[PDB]
Amino acid sequence: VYPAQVDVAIVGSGPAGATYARILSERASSATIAMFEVGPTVSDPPGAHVKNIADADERAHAQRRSEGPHARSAQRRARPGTYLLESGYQADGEDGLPVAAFSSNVGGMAAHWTGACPRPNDSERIGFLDETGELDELLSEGERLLGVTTDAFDASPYAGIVRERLAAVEDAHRDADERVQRMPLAVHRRDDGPLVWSGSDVVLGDITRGNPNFTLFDESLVTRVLVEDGRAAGVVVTDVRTGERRDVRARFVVVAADALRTPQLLWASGIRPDALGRYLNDQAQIVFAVRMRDFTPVVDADGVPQTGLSEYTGVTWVPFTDDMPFHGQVMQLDASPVKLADDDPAAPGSIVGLGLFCAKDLQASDRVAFSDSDVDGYGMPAMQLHYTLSDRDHATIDRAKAEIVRLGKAIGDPLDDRPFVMPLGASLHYQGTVRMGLADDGASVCSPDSEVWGAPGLFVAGNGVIPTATACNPTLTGVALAVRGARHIADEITADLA
Numbered sequence: 239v240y241p242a243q244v245d246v247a248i249v250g251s252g253p254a255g256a257t258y259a260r261i262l263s264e265r266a267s268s269a270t271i272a273m274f275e276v277g278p279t280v281s282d283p284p285g286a287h288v289k290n291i292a293d294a295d296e297r298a299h300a301q302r303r304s305e306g307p308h309a310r311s312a313q314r315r316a317r318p319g320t321y322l323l324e325s326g327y328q329a330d331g332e333d334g335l336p337v338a339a340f341s342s343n344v345g346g347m348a349a350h351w352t353g354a355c356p357r358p359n360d361s362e363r364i365g366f367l368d369e370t371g372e373l374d375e376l377l378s379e380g381e382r383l384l385g386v387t388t389d390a391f392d393a394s395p396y397a398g399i400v401r402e403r404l405a406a407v408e409d410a411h412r413d414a415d416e417r418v419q420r421m422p423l424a425v426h427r428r429d430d431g432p433l434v435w436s437g438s439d440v441v442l443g444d445i446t447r448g449n450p451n452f453t454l455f456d457e458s459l460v461t462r463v464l465v466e467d468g469r470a471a472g473v474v475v476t477d478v479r480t481g482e483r484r485d486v487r488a489r490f491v492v493v494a495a496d497a498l499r500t501p502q503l504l505w506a507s508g509i510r511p512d513a514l515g516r517y518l519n520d521q522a523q524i525v526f527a528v529r530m531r532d533f534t535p536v537v538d539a540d541g542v543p544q545t546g547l548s549e550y551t552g553v554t555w556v557p558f559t560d561d562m563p564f565h566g567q568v569m570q571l572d573a574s575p576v577k578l579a580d581d582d583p584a585a586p587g588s589i590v591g592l593g594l595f596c597a598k599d600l601q602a603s604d605r606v607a608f609s610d611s612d613v614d615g616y617g618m619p620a621m622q623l624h625y626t627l628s629d630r631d632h633a634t635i636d637r638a639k640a641e642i643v644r645l646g647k648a649i650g651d652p653l654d655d656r657p658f659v660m661p662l663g664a665s666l667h668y669q670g671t672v673r674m675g676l677a678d679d680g681a682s683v684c685s686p687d688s689e690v691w692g693a694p695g696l697f698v699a700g701n702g703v704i705p706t707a708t709a710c711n712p713t714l715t716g717v718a719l720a721v722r723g724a725r726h727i728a729d730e731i732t733a734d735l736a
């Protein structure tokens with residue numbers, strides 16, 4: 239049932255592919271757009287967060303259906319809704335990324351995420367985009383695409399307690415962009431009431447869902463980018479249910495398949511610039527849990543809602559600075575990406591999690607490589623992950639450990655006297671494998687318009703495009719770069735009237 243040809247073909251249905259779809263439905267409403275996603279549709283509207291599902295059985299089922307090719311080792315475990323590499327996650331003598339993870343479903347990982355959307359600060363910021371002022375406009379556009387808000391928790395009885403206690407011990411030398419503040423969150427209220435995380439449902443929006451020139455094929459594996467006469471020419475799509483392959487022609491191909499499957503697809507298609515898969519970076523994650531002190535109990539608590547989130551302390555943001563190079567977030571437990579502790583039923587909302595994230599010392603040898611012979615559960619070239627912590631990595635991680643204890647003691651009594659360094663890959667923030675650069679000099683995969691050097695008309699999208707060393711949650715930034723790329727494709731299409 240696939241089209242013979244469309245104008246733009248998008249592989250991937252998380253916020254990056256969705257960003258391209260929505261921006262072209264806005265600025266290029268005349269263009270036909272096909273989106274191919276290998277995973278099933280597990281939520282309504284497609285791409286919506288699993289916490290929209292009220293029945294616990296159905297919700298657990300949506301999660302299990304997102305967990306990869308085998309979905310129809312107790313010491314190396316994936317969070318629900320994601321799956322790990324079965325092998326190739328670590329080479330001899332290397333740290334590797336033991337819990338590098340993926341999601342395969344409409345909505346991508348954003349059907350399962352915890353929605354935190356900070357802006358990059360200081361050296362995390364892409365400078366050639368920051369100098370023109372365009373970076374701020376792109377980040378504003380991404381906040382619009384994700385419906386990002388800071389106020390979602392401002393009415394709860396515990397509003398501001400965590401922010402107050404942190405501000406008490408925060409250096410009087412930081413300015414507004416750097417002081418303790420609310421986390422900006424990709425969250426919205428359901429018409430029936432409950433707060434819930436926002437994903438590709440929100441990025442796609444009613445403008446994409448109502449666009450008669452747009453189509454979404456779930457359970458559709460892209461095995462190849464068709465290149466012809468120098469340019470991107472289309473995609474090869476396998477219907478996962480019947481197994482038949484078909485070519486879809488396209489003047490534009492956007493690959494937003496996450497930071498490791500996007501290089502996978504490009505390698506399988508013979509598009510192999512030297513930077514492809516290289517400069518891969520995860521954000522080492524340190525976690526901590528504390529019981530808040532001096533906690534006025536609420537006389538008539540609501541009892542956890544059957545969809546969406548509870549409203550306890552919310553999420554606070556402790557911003558990255560060059561001088562203090564960790565992204566910090568303090569979270570009520572149902573907003574943490576990692577199970578840290580159980581809430582006290584005697585005092586709901588009093589146990590809070592903390593996570594600090596480090597910036598990686600970027601290395602050429604930190605990469606994802608691919609096999610000529612072996613294949614994964616989708617029949618795509620199998621990955622081998624090469625990843626080493628430098629001494630600078632270890633030094634900054636030790637700093638993060640001391641700082642997370644200092645921040646947690648300011649809030650309450652720690653559940654443990656020392657924090658925990660999560661296994662590498664646990665942050666689920668993988669950047670750099672298809673990084674943008676100013677010039678085709680071998681050190682980048684794509685241009686500032688996200689177009690890959692040497693394959694005009696081929697575009698890349700997601701956290702893999704971020705070329706800098708970052709600590710903060712990357713999705714907002716990946717979506718912002720997607721905004722620039724999709725605007726460029728719209729420019730090209732409207733100009734095609736020549």
Ligand SMILES: Cc1cc2nc3c(=O)[nH]c(=O)nc-3n(C[C@H](O)[C@H](O)[C@H](O)COP(=O)(O)OP(=O)(O)OC[C@H]3O[C@@H](n4cnc5c(N)ncnc54)[C@H](O)[C@@H]3O)c2cc1C
Pocket residue numbers: 249250251252253254255274275276277317320341342343344345346347348350351352353354355458459460461494495496497499500503575666667699700701711712713714716
């Ligand atoms: C529990 C959890 C908590 C998180 N918390 C945060 C947070 O607070 N802040 C933040 O910024 N991020 C967070 N993240 C990470 C966030 O989900 C990702 O950064 C974001 O989803 C990246 O979007 P993407 O579209 O680039 O890739 P993805 O979200 O992975 O989507 C890519 C899609 O491409 C599809 N695809 C891949 N290959 C093919 C193919 N070959 N053919 C067809 N389809 C293909 C995949 O199946 C997937 O659906 C969290 C993630 C999880 C799991």
